[PDB]
Structures are given as C-alpha cells and as structure tokens.
Amino acid sequence: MYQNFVTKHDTAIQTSRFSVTGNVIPAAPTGNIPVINGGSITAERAVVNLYANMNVSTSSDGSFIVAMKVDTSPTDPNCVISAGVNLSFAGTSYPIVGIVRFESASEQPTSIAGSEVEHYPIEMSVGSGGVCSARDCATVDIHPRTSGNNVFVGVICSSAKWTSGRVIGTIATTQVIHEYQVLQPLK
Amino acid sequence: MYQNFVTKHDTAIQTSRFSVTGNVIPAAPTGNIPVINGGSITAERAVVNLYANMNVSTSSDGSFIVAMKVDTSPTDPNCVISAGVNLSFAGTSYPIVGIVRFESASEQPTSIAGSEVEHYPIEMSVGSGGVCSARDCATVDIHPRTSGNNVFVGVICSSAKWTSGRVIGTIATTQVIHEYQVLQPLK
Amino acid sequence: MYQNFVTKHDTAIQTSRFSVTGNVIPAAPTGNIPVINGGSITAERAVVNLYANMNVSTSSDGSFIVAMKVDTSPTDPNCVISAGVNLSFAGTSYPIVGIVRFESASEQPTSIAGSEVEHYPIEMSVGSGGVCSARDCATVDIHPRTSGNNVFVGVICSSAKWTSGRVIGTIATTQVIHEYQVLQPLK
Amino acid sequence: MYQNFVTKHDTAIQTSRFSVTGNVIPAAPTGNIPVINGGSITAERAVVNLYANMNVSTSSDGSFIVAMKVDTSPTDPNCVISAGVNLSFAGTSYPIVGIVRFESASEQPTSIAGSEVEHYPIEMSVGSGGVCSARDCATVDIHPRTSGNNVFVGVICSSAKWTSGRVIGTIATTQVIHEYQVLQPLK
Amino acid sequence: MKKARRSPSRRKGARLWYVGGSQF
Amino acid sequence: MKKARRSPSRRKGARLWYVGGSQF
Amino acid sequence: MKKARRSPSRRKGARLWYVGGSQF
Amino acid sequence: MKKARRSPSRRKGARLWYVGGSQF
Amino acid sequence: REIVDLSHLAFDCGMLGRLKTVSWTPVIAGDSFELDAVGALRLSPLRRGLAIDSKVDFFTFYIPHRHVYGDQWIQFMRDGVNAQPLPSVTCNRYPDHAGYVGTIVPANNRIPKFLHQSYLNIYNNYFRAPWMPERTEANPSNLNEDDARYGFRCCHLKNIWSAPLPPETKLAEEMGIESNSIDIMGLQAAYAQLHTEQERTYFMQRYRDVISSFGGSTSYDADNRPLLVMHTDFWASGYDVDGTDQSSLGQFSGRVQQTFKHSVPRFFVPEHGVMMTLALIRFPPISPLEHHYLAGKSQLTYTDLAGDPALIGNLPPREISYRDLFRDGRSGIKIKVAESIWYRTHPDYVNFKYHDLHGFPFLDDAPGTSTGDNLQEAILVRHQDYDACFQSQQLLQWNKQARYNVSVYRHMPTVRDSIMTS
Amino acid sequence: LIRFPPISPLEHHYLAGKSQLTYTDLAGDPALIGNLPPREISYRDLFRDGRSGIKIKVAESIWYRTHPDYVNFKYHDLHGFPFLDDAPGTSTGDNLQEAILVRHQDYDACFQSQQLLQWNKQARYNVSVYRHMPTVRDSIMTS
Amino acid sequence: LIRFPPISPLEHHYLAGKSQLTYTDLAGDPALIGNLPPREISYRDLFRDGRSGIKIKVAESIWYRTHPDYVNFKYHDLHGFPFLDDAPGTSTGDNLQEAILVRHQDYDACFQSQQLLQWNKQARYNVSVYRHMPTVRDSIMTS
C-alpha cells in the first residue's frame, strides 16, 4: 500500500536530547508544578528520556512538566506544537497528559506556579492504569504576552492519585516551524 | 514527515478559561444535571480546569456537565462543535463523555433537567476505569428552538457507578466559527 | 489549525430520540435477541438514550439490539450506515458492539431470532471491562431481500459474560442519505 | 465504501522473517539493552516472531530491542521508518514501544549500550497491562553519523515493572524506500 | 446550455398579470 | 476517438430486421 | 471585474488634501 | 518574470576574471 | 460648476428575496450627477453543481429631501443659517441594523431620516404588491432583525400563483331591484359604474395611474414618489468546480460569478436629496411540487378545457387555492385568477426526484408552506427557503463587489478656498 | 512600498453620523463653504468604534467633495480580507500620528502564513554605468 | 429515451458457437440462403452463459449480414462500464420479451450513485402558439 507521510508529531532528529533521573515530586495546581529540566532544550525540538522514580512526598495527586522553550522569531501569530509521549508507570496511577504554555523571565525555570500554566488537551492514545501514550498537537500563540518574558511550551503529566514507583518512557515535543524532508519513493 | 494541520478540535487560545474546585455531585437523568459553571464562558471557546472532588451524596450513578454558551449570530443553520477532554479519576468509575445541547432563558444555568438535554455521542479515545479522554466534534443546530432562550452546548461526563474521590483534568470545548491561523513552513 | 469537517458518523439533530429504561435481558444468538424498542424511530436517524438495568435472568452471556428502520426509497443498491455508541456498565462485562441488519414483516419488532441477524464489525474505540465506545460505519444493502418485509438496521451490544447492574449511555445510529450542512469559516 | 489504500506501516512480504525463542532478559538504560537478533535482517524489511519467555534475571524494569539494519544507499538525508507491533504478555507489565536508532561497527549487534540509543516515540494503539499494540512510523536520518559504522533501526519494548512469563506476538518494522504496489479495483 | 439555466421571460404575447399597479 | 465511443449504425446496405412492424 | 478590485483614484477634480507639503 | 528567474550574465563591459587561464 | 469625484468601491452581500441598498450619495440642488458602476456578483458556494441562474435587478432612484422632511425641509432651506436642525431617526443598538439603507449604524445609533424614509418610499412605490399594506415603520429601530439587516422582502417573479388578481377582486356585482321589475337603464349605469371600479382594482390603485388613465400626467412630487433614474437586470451565471480526490472525484460545486455594468446617464438634480442604488437577487420559483392547473382539476368541464372564447371573455374571475396548484399546496390560501389563464401560460417542471436533493435553488415546499394560510406571506420571497442549498452563508446568500464611478458637476469652492481665510 | 487602500466595514459617511443635521452641513451653500474655519471632529464621528480621543481638523463640507468606500459590516469579522476590521488607531491609543501611519499588524489576520513576511518579490535589476574605470587587467598588472 | 447499445463480453459470433459447421452455415451459398426457412436458435448459441430456454427465429445466414461488437472477457467484471456483463435475460427467466425489453437494473452496477436516477437533463422549451384567446384584460373586465 501507499505510505502515509503526514503525521501529527515529528520527533526531533539527533538533537535536543536529555535524560531525566532521580525523583520526581508531582504537585497540585494550587502549588508550583515541577519542571523536571535545568537543561531545557529549545529548538522547540525536545526529546526527554525518563528513567526516574515517581515519589509522593508532597501531594498524593498532582502533576509534573517537561518543557522546552519556544522560538519567537516567526512573525506568524501562532504555530502548531506537537508532542509524543510514552510512559509506563510501575504503580497504577492512571497518568494523563496534555500540552501547556507558560511564560517566565527566567531562562531555565525549575518550577512554575499552577496558576500561571495554560492548558491544551490532546487525543490521548492510551490511558491504562500503568501507561499513558499520546501523539498529537495543538495551536498556541507563540509571542510573549508580557513584554520581557520567555515563552515555554511542553507536556504536563497529571494523576488523580499517584503511586510511588519507577517511571520510564519518552516525552518528545516540538514546535512546527520546519517539516523534516523525507524520501518518498514515487517522486 | 509532513505535519498534519487539520484537527477535530482546536482548544481556545489564552481565553475563556475557568477553574472548577470543590465538590461535584453527579445526578441521574431523571433529575437535574449539575452544570458546574456560574462563570460560564461563551465565545463558545471554553477551557474548564478540573481539580475537584467527585462526591456521591445524591445518586451513585449519574453525570455532570461543563457548558458554554453558543454564539447565535451566524445565519448558517448549524455549525460544528468540538470538545477535548482529559480526566483522571481517583476512584474507578469508568467515566464516559459526549456533547450536549440544551436551552435556557437563564444566562448562567446552574443545572439542567435531564429531560431537557440533547445528546451527541463522540469517538472516545480512552475509557479505562480511571481515565476518560476524547477529542472529537459533532454537528449541532445553533439557533434557539424556543423563541427567547439562550443556546448552550458542552460536554457531559457520566458513569454507571461513580466512586467518591478526587478528579483532575481539562474539559475544553468550542463552536467552530473560526479556524485558528497557523504557521505552515511550506507556504 | 484547520477544522476537520468529515466524520464517520453524524448523530441526528433534534429528532428521532427515545429513552430506554427498566430491565434489559440479553440473550444468546441461539435464541431471540431483544430489540429494546417499540417506539422504533426510522429516518434511520436514531438516538437512543440508555438508563436501564442490565439483568441476567435468561443467559449469562449474550446480546441486545437497538434498532431503527431503513428508508428504502433510494434507487441506489446500498448506502452507508453509521453508529456512535457510549456505554458505561456498572458490572464488568467487557461489552462489544457492531452494526446489524435484519428484516421483518412487522413494523415494530420487539425481538429478532439470532439466526435472522446479519453482522457488520466496526472499529471499536474502547472496550474496557466497564465501557465500550465506538463511532464508525459500514456498507449495507438497503433493499428488502424478501418481498414484503421492512429492513432494519442498528447496533448490537454483546458480552461473553454479563454482570447484573446499571448501564448508561447513548446508542446513536443513522443511514447516510443526507450530509448535514455545516458552517465552514473559510467558505 | 471506498477502500483505504494508504497506511502508516507496510509489513514486508514473504521476506526478512525470523523467529525468536527462549529467554529475553530486559535491561535498564544504564546498562546494555538486549538486541534479541543474530540473524538481523535488513532490507529494512523485518518481521520478527516472538514466542519466548520474558525473564527477570537482571533488572525488574527495563527493555529489549528488535533491530534491523538500514540501507544507506539513498542520497536522501533521511527517510521514514515504520513499525507494527502486537505483543501479548502473560504477566501484567504494561509494555511500551517505540522506534530507535543506533550505530555500530558490528554487522550483528547482540546488545547496545543504552546511552548509544536514540528514541522516537509513536502512537501506541493499545497499552493494557498485558498487551501493547502499535502501527506507526517516524522520520530518521539514515546516514552513518560516525564514519565507518552501520546504522540500525528497530522497535524497543520497555516496562516500569516486568513480570516473568511468556510473551507472544510479532514485531515488524521497515524503512520506506519502496511502496508495495497494490490492486486498486477502480484504476 | 445557456438558456437552459435561466427560466424563460414569457415576453412574447400580451399582458397577463394585473395586480393593481406596477410591481417589480 | 469520436466514433470509437459510439457503436456503429449499420445504416449501409439493405433491411435486416423484420419484427412485425415499426419498433423504435 | 478589473477596476472592482482596486479602489478608485479620485484623480478628477481639484486638490483635496493639504497636509503641510508633499507626502507619498 | 522571465529574466527575474535567471541571474544576469554581466556580458557587457570588459574582462573581470583572471584566474590563470580558461575555466568553465 | 466644477467636478467633484465621488467614485468608490463597495463590498456587499445579502439574502435572496430581500431588497438591499448598495450605495447612496447625497446630492445638492443644481448638481449634474452621472454614475457608471461595474463589478461582479456572486452567490455563496452551492452544495451541488449549477442548476439555474438567479435574476439580478439594480435600481437607482433620486429622492428630494423635501419628500422626506416635508414642510420641515422647506422651512430648513428657507430659514437658511437659522434653521432648526433636522431630526435624526433611531436604530437598534447593533452595527448591522442599518444594513437595509446601506450603512453601518453610526456611533450614536441614529441615521439621517432621508435614508430610512427613502428606502420606505422606494419600497412602497414600486416593490410591494399595490394591494399589500403600505409599509410604515417610523424608525429603523421599529424594524425587525431580518428586515433591518437585509432589507425588506419583495415579490416572487410573476407567475399564476404569485400574481393573482388583488385579493379583494369582485366576483359578482349585485344590483337591487323593485319586487317585480328591473330598471334596465339603471342596469346599464350599474355596469358602467362597475367598470370604473374594476379598472381601478385591476390596475389603477395608485393615484398617478388613475390620472394616466385620463391621458393626463403627474409630476413625481404629486404623490411623493421616488424618481426611478435607471433600472438594470441580468442573469447570474458561473461555473462548476470539479472534485478530484478519492471520494470527491465525480462531484461538483457550483460557483456563480457574474460581471455586470449599471450605468446612470448624466442626471440633473433639481433639489437637494439622495441618489440611492439598490439590488435585488431572485430565483425563479421553480418547484417539483407545482403541476399544471388542468392536471389538478378533478372534474374537467367544457369551460375548463374547450377554451371557448365566448366564455373566456365574459366569465368572472375564478377563485382557487394553492392546493389546486401544488400537491402539498395549502388549501387555505385562496387566489383569484383569470379564466382559462392556464391556457395562456405554461409552468416550469422539475421531476419530483430533485424534491429532496439539497443544493438546488428550487422551492422544495409549496410556497407559503411555513407561513400559514396567508397570501402575502407566500408571495413575498422567504429567503430561508434557500438556506438548504448553500454550503455556508459566511457571506449571507449572495454578495458582490463593484466600483462606482461617480462624477458630479456642482458649485463647490475649492478646498483651498475653504481652508484659507483671506 | 506596498499598501492597501484603507477600506473599513466600520467607516460611514460623515453625514450619516451627525446627530443634528444643520443647514451648514447639508445645504452645501457656497457662501458658507468658502468662509468658515476648519472643523474639528473625531474618529468617533467617522467610524462606529471610532476613537473619540483622536481629533482631526477637516475642511468644511469636505464630505461633499468625496465619497468613502463601503463594506457591509458582515465582512467585518471574516478573516482573509485586507480590510481594516477595526477603526484606525484602535490599538495605538488617542494618538493621530499612530493612526495615520500604517500598522502592518492590522493585516496579519488575512494571511495563511507569513513565512515570507506579508509581501515579497524578485526582480532583475539591469544596471549599466559609464565611468572612468581602468580595466581589471590594468589594475592587476604592474608594468 | 436514453439507451446503451447492448455490448457484451459474453456474446460471440454465431459461427464461433456452432459445434458442427455445415456447408449451409459456412458456404454462404445464395441458392440456399434464399429458399430455406427461418432458423430456430437460442441465446445459448450466442452468449456463453446464454439461456437455452430463450428461443429466437432468425433468418438464414444472417450472421453473414452483420458483425457483433466485441469486448474482451476481462471487462466482464469491472464495475463502471455500461456493458451487459450478463447475457440478456439472465435474471428474467426463459422469457424472450423480458430479455428484449431493456432492464435498467443491468446498469446500476456502473454508477457511483443514482441520486438523480441513471440519467437526467435540463432544457428550455420555447413554445409559441397562435390561437383565438381573448386578452386577460378582456377576461377580467366585465363591461
């Protein structure tokens, strides 16, 4: 059959990678959501590899974020932002994902107040008790709303009731300002 | 690969947001379904954030609604209404969602009799015991059927057997009367 | 992004609705499948609302049907028939759905012998122990095969092992002989 | 209805097959991931049949890889790589899959250091506790980044907490440099 | 297929419509 | 490729079909 | 439908805009 | 828009490029 | 007596049966006004291919401000620089609710009376059936949603069921008679009198037309009728767009796009006022439900079929109902037609099959089917009747854009003269 | 310099906006038109959402010397038309200069995507210049 | 009346179907052709799946007076061609009249969708008729 060359999300190639380990302390939206990145990539091409331990020290329910900085060069008002996630959790917690947008004068935000995060729901492929998967995108205004901030985008992972345990997977995300050229046998 | 620029639901940008907290008392269709909104947005662009407690005071089975008012300006008979939901429930209850339409002379309906609600089923991405996800749309006549009412649309979340516990997620919904312009690298 | 205006199933608008309550006694194909309708709509536009009790009086495994009469006016040999279902069951039974076709000289069939039912499998969105969801369609010959009968079509819901309990949802189904016009912002 | 001739992954025909049996010892990314192949096919057409025993001798969480060598003939910078997997596990472990790329001067890599593996997340069809299924693709640069190596691509299967037991299924994967011609009744 | 799209004028012949006066 | 779409007329030659009378 | 796309010039008649000097 | 696609020839005038000999 | 250039563009759009203003220009006594408009007219995207062309009408009337403001105007002009300013009329607080008179509702929510009143006068003097109620709204704010935004509704193109003799047409004229005798001289007068009554009902309902009857004439000031300066009409055709993808292959969408010129020859403006130009797009009322009158009669009589002249010229009008013309015809709508009229004209035909295919601008329901047993409501074009055949009214049902080249000679000091003191 | 004539579904004829129509406004009496001083009015007097803080001084009865373009308020919110869907200066504040100068953002709305900004072009510039210029041979050769 | 010439991938030359070719069949000897009686044959003798129960009486050596259209058996099952993909009368039974009369269903196969039946048309019928007919004015006026 004919090969399908269009996709909702195209993972970065050979670049913008980082591995996250150790503990990850999810938090409630009333507090400050953990941005498990200090080495926050940003060609808004990001591939974060997870091999950490989901730890419930703070709240038993909440969420954490994997973010990447948006390129604000484009004169276009807003562009598409796709993400691709695959996470297996040792402890049944029924993960849930989505795209988010938040600004910060800081270059490497370690956390962001829940009240400052904007949400964008996405087609979630799977949502079993132990694994969440999704590959989708959403439209997001890319210019800084408050003169002087940096614009961040990324996927957030939440749960109604987390369970201490290991988590493993990949959180990829990209702002589309380039479509990767590809060999199409019939052209 | 080529980026897919068409989507079944486009979440509002920077506007029409509201956070719902506290308790949510689902109800049976024989009674009055809870419209967990007083600050009901309406560019029929709505993003409702959930961080509440699903409480079974009334019935053990039932449903609640997240609504938004329809813009009745368009001379077109009916337009498309998309929704995007992601909900993780602490207590296994096997949620279920769908689009609904109901009229009311009131500007901010706090609840609506089940007999007055019209249903529109949608492709439900996931329906595990603890999480329901969906991103789809349906065709709905937008003009008030009974002279003098306001037309509301939104997504309803039901369950055959709910379980007291925390619920967290996002219920986004919009009436398509504008397609958000987006940067397409090859144009 | 661009709004997706094509869908596999379009639920009827403001018409052909009916609510089914009480008990529903599923049956094995060797017997007579329950057509939980006496007020069987038929613009082959049908929206059936479920808020009943799944009762295992007869067999512990089996199925029930929600049907609607086909309009046989079209000279076309056969047309598409779409259905959209969302059902949450209180008792884990792993529902399963599909489109069916069966004839009957009767105008309001209360049940149909399993041997007289024809099957058409469909992409089933979700099939957890407690909820089945699907929105798809299939091609079906619409003219009466046996001179003098009426042609019925609808979705059937089966289970390998049912569990007495409440069931709630919506079974929508339609024969495509009209595509609902819709506001497309760019035309 | 009209037949859909485009697909995200086209499994090889009559060629590049191999059956894997015995034990499969998953490993953590900090170590060396098992490439359960010595008879590694490579028209980057590969169909690996699984009928082995998932054994947790080393780590309780981790992953294994099914790989195939990439044809580096094409002058095109990068081409699409699709995979199609269906795995049923006896012991609930919530599998998870994805495409990977790694180089090696060796012709038949028996294992690859986790640090040397590059990830590409994919739409995962199902991710129940006992079965993972997916049929998707991703864009990957096909030329050897380090002069003198061979480029391998394949799907990786991971888990937050594996469970000793039998595993059975098929891991198919192909690099698109040919679209299989097919009979289209209307041409 | 030029005329076939537009309903004739019925301009030939006498007056048929008396409606009280001039009506566009 | 004008004639190739329409089956010939077989107008040349004599009468072939006697069917009892005129039949369109 | 050539002129219909371009807003007229209003070149006919006298001068209307005094703005202090020449302005393109 | 014929010339606009092709970079001029700079054929007018004298010789500019001395590179040691003939080079295509 | 120098030139003023009032040329300008205009992008507009509206509903089918309704009459909309597309451009108005205020003029002054002494002005010489010339207008040459040119542009293109289109219809929203059709569901299917092209079927029938719509008929477009453009009008340009001249209306003396005196006709609007009455004596109040005369005083205005008389009192000159001491005149009490003319009053404005009110609109509903919505941008579009002034659309019928071709303008956005200004910041203060009121527009000059001459716009509103003229529109009325135009409608009442030329567009409505002479027998229909005179349109008399006092302020744009007294108008209803649809009217105010899209213009009033006009009559369908004339046909047997939309051009019946005025509803009050006499079907019999009684004449009293002494218990046993009849005054044959009176009978004679009786007829004569009747004749005057008929002539009036049938075609002299307007004063001006009665006076024309005598072979006289009337100025447009006599009954305050807007002056028609130019009337254009044309068919709106276009092309089909071929569908080319897997499922759309073999499908078509009708894109109607017609170019047109509307030119008013140099006109002399005797008094201050407005030059309004309006458009009206309509579809001939074809219907898969209408049938020949004779096909519907149950008992065919000599008088119906024979077409015997002797009868056709001396019988009274015939009362019949829409039921007698359409299968789903409303029996409550009665019309008075002229005997054997069905023998003077043939109706269009559409196989009942198109009856339910969306995309054809046919009346898929007998006229007046959703307005009740009311004739006027059936005759006036109901634009909704067409909603069915458009992919989407993002720009209402029709729309157009054109350049209006206007040149006006008039006494007008140069801007330099105005801004310079000495 | 590429520009779009400033058409706007929000602009209306000056006279349509006046509340109290006076002889001086309507009459078009020459005697007056040539000897009155300029008239101060505001954008509010020209656009429905016109900013009242932007004042302009126009010449008497100028509205009788030129007619403005018209766009049915319906196009007012359809993306894709290069009309000014908002009274000029609506987002620059009560400042005239800022309203007069073209604000390119006012057009962002109607473009599928500015991958090449709003406009773009390509052309061949044939330039021939006569001048005193020793041949390259002369420059590179010493003797 | 719209019709399609009855082409069929199943029809073959009469002579191709005869099992025992005789002088009378092949020779085309005039002396015989003018004095023999009609010949009774069946659809089976003309189409491969021809119905043997449908008998027809043709004129001797008529197959030598006309040639039949040809369609490679391959088109036999491709939907979209208005050919008779089944010997005429195949679904009407051993009845001649039913085979001769055009069965419109035979074509359902080749149409994407009969939303407007199989064919359709639109035309303007300009009719002018001279006749004795008092003017409408005369009818509605009494005196």
Side-chain angles (χ1 to χ4, degrees), chain I residues 48 50-51 165 191 194-195 198-199 202-203 249 309 312-313 315 338 343-344 353-354 357, chain K residues 112 114-117 120-122 124 131-143:
Chain I
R48 314 189 112 263
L50 296 182
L165 284 5
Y191 276 123
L194 170 57
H195 182 279
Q198 316 217 85
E199 256 188 349
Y202 295 138
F203 47 89
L249 193 70
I312 311 188
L315 301 193
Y343 261 123
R344 291 205 193 62
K353 222 309 159 63
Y354 301 77
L357 313 198
Chain K
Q112 271 178 60
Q114 303 146 63
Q115 200 55 177
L116 269 184
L117 307 182
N120 68 84
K121 62 74 142 179
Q122 55 172 301
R124 179 143 149 184
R131 74 168 57 144
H132 303 66
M133 179 67 72
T135 162
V136 179
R137 194 170 188 299
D138 291 355
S139 299
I140 71 179
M141 290 292 257
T142 297
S143 31

Side-chain angles (χ1 to χ4, degrees), chain I residues 4-6 8-13 20 24-25 28 76-77 80-81 85-86 88 94-95 102-110 112 272 394-395 400 410 412-415 417-419, chain J residues 9-13 15-24 26-28 30 32-34 36 44 47-48 59-61 64-75 78 81 83:
Chain I
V4 175
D5 189 347
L6 312 178
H8 61 296
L9 287 179
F11 291 73
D12 209 352
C13 59
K20 185 177 193 301
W24 57 274
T25 306
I28 307 174
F76 184 85
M77 286 308 295
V81 66
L86 301 184
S88 279
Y94 298 115
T103 197
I104 177 171
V105 176
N108 60 65
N109 301 301
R110 322 167 77 96
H272 300 59
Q394 200 55 177
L395 269 184
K400 62 74 142 179
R410 74 168 57 144
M412 179 67 72
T414 162
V415 179
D417 291 354
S418 299
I419 71 179
Chain J
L10 290 162
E11 178 185 359
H12 60 260
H13 191 293
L15 290 182
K18 191 65 186 287
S19 303
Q20 225 67 68
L21 271 177
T22 147
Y23 182 83
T24 315
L26 257 181
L32 296 191
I33 311 188
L36 301 193
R44 193 95 183 305
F47 305 84
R48 181 192 181 59
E60 271 298 330
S61 289
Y64 261 123
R65 291 205 193 62
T66 199
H67 203 289
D69 289 290
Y70 169 60
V71 172
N72 179 311
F73 188 73
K74 222 309 159 63
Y75 301 77
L78 313 198
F81 291 108
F83 303 136

Side-chain angles (χ1 to χ4, degrees), chain I residues 165-358:
Chain I
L165 284 5
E168 74 285 5
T169 298
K170 283 190 186 293
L171 287 184
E173 245 288 288
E174 297 302 327
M175 191 209 147
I177 47 188
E178 307 101 304
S179 209
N180 295 305
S181 61
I182 175 174
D183 175 13
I184 66 179
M185 285 181 102
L187 172 61
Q188 186 62 29
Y191 276 123
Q193 307 185 59
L194 170 57
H195 182 279
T196 108
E197 285 178 290
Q198 316 217 85
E199 256 188 349
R200 238 152 276 257
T201 293
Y202 295 138
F203 47 89
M204 294 193 265
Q205 277 189 48
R206 299 239 187 59
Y207 175 78
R208 46 185 167 88
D209 291 329
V210 169
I211 301 292
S212 286
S213 162
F214 284 65
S217 72
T218 61
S219 61
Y220 55 75
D221 278 318
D223 61 340
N224 259 57
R225 58 171 181 285
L227 173 46
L228 200 208
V229 178
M230 233 302 84
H231 169 50
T232 303
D233 75 315
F234 66 89
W235 296 97
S237 200
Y239 61 113
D240 282 318
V241 179
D242 307 324
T244 70
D245 87 45
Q246 194 173 183
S247 29
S248 74
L249 193 70
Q251 192 180 326
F252 311 87
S253 172
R255 177 187 199 185
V256 41
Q257 194 177 201
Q258 190 57 297
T259 9
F260 68 97
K261 295 188 179 187
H262 175 78
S263 40
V264 172
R266 192 160 300 302
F267 164 72
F268 174 65
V269 183
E271 308 181 64
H272 300 59
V274 194
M275 295 299 281
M276 291 183 74
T277 299
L278 323 74
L280 175 59
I281 336 300
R282 296 176 277 170
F283 270 122
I286 310 305
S287 171
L289 290 162
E290 178 185 359
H291 60 260
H292 191 293
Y293 177 64
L294 290 182
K297 191 65 186 287
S298 303
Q299 225 67 68
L300 271 177
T301 147
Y302 182 83
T303 315
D304 315 359
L305 257 181
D308 183 316
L311 296 191
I312 311 188
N314 312 82
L315 301 193
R318 185 127 132 181
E319 193 186 64
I320 65 175
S321 65
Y322 276 24
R323 193 95 183 305
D324 297 308
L325 293 174
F326 305 84
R327 181 192 181 59
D328 61 316
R330 194 183 281 277
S331 60
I333 290 176
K334 306 288 196 158
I335 59 178
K336 295 175 185 175
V337 306
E339 271 298 330
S340 289
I341 182 169
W342 45 88
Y343 261 123
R344 291 205 193 62
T345 199
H346 203 289
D348 289 290
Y349 169 60
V350 172
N351 179 311
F352 188 73
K353 222 309 159 63
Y354 301 77
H355 127 78
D356 68 305
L357 313 198
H358 294 182

